[PDB]
Amino acid sequence: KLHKEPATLIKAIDGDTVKLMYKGQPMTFRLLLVDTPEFNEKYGPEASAFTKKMVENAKKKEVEFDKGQRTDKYGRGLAYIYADGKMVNEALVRQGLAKVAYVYKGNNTHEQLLRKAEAQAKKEKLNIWS
Ligand SMILES: Cc1cn([C@H]2C[C@H](OP(=O)(O)O)[C@@H](COP(=O)(O)O)O2)c(=O)[nH]c1=O
Ligand SMILES: [Ca+2]
């Protein structure tokens, strides 16, 4: 309750940040509840590429704010991002390309969903968990 919103993509940045045109400012958005490696750390180039293609290839790009703060202290948007109905945040965790991270109580609606995904990635020893 939680609603999605069309997202306009300027460019993918790395595993867990993307640049959107949001009411027609260029704005970095940071993915809620996850942490990908930096572009120059192990699985960093893979996380970047996964997010990039996932959002680029989607006909329908959406942003969904949580119930709490919509920007962080750095002025980045904080959201879940969906590509043709699939959550990027979740897909990264499921593939072992992001850890569940930065879980704040104002903004934690999809926590249990991402922890389930993380547990599957862990069990499978996938990427980060290898
Ligand atoms: C994901 C997320 C990060 N942050 C902050 C925490 C970290 O701040 P500090 O810089 O003070 O440690 C930083 C991590 O982002 P990155 O993982 O993009 O570097 O962004 C939030 O404030 N809210 C959030 O929802
Ligand atoms: Ca990161």
From Swiss-Prot:
Residues 110-126 have a biased composition (Basic and acidic residues). It is found in: Secreted. The gene is nuc. The chain holds residues 88 to 223 of 231 of the full protein. Residues 110-130 are annotated as: Disordered. The active site is at R30, E38, R76. This is Nuclease A. Ca(2+) binds at D16, D35, T36.
